[PDB]
Design a protein around this ligand. Structure first.
Ligand SMILES: Cc1cccc2c(=O)[nH]c(-c3ccc(Cl)cc3)cc12
Ligand SMILES: [Zn+2]
Length: 208
């Protein structure tokens, strides 16, 4: 029951989502090995993901978390990059979309930095790059990221140099404590705590 609604580039929703995408690009410690070398994107399309069942699943769980956390869902909009983006938008997030080897354990990971999620669009470590050219820094092939509504509830703070959530917590927050330019990464352990709200189709752009 998923439908995708194209947003117009004239729409303020399109513009606000694009700005979040572009403004959260950062340099990566791998020098672009996983995600490619770029400072900005060419946004080709932004679609709204509409699925009533998946939404109701999300808002049900959001209410539960909120009632366990002084009426505060601690909801964020975060990026998700994955080879399973087509499955996620149709069936929702679940245990099959977990990053089993992630630094905070087997959970579903999200980024404040769009360029962090970009590293995972072709798989862990960028896999073997785009399917057409086998290039992790391909400037031709279309990529997709999700911009997702995520319920963090009480988040366990991990200073950073499916499984269960730490007891008493609903998520983990990975706070960067070496790379001063990196934004936070987040992990949830239940698929119902995220809704894939926007599908963004883009290319990375070769620096001038
Ligand atoms: C580790 C991490 C930090 C911040 C964002 C992300 C992300 O967007 N995706 C992933 C990811 C997704 C799917 C698989 Cl199979 C592996 C890693 C991982 C990830
Ligand atoms: Zn390619």
């Amino acid at each position: 029951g998923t439908i995708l609604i194209d947003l117009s580039p004239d729409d303020k929703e399109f513009q606000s989502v694009e700005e979040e995408m572009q403004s959260t690009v950062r340099e990566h410690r791998d020098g672009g090995h996983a995600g490619g070398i770029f400072n900005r994107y060419n946004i080709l399309k932004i679609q709204k993901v509409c699925n009533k069942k998946l939404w109701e699943r999300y808002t049900h769980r959001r209410k539960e978390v909120s009632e366990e956390n002084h009426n505060h869902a601690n909801e964020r909009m975060l990026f998700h990059g994955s080879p399973f983006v087509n499955a996620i938008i149709h069936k929702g997030f679940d245990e099959r979309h977990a990053y089993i080897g992630g630094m905070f354990g087997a959970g579903i990971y999200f980024a404040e930095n769009s360029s962090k999620s970009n590293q995972y669009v072709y798989g862990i470590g960028g896999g073997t790059g785009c399917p057409v050219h086998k290039d992790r820094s391909c400037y031709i092939c279309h990529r997709q990221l999700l911009f997702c509504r995520v319920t963090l509830g009480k988040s366990f703070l991990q200073f950073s140099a499916m499984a269960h959530s730490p007891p008493g917590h609903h998520s983990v927050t990975g706070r960067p404590s070496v790379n001063g330019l990196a934004l936070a990464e987040y992990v949830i352990y239940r698929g119902e705590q995220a809704y894939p709200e926007y599908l963004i189709t883009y290319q990375i752009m070769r620096p001038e």
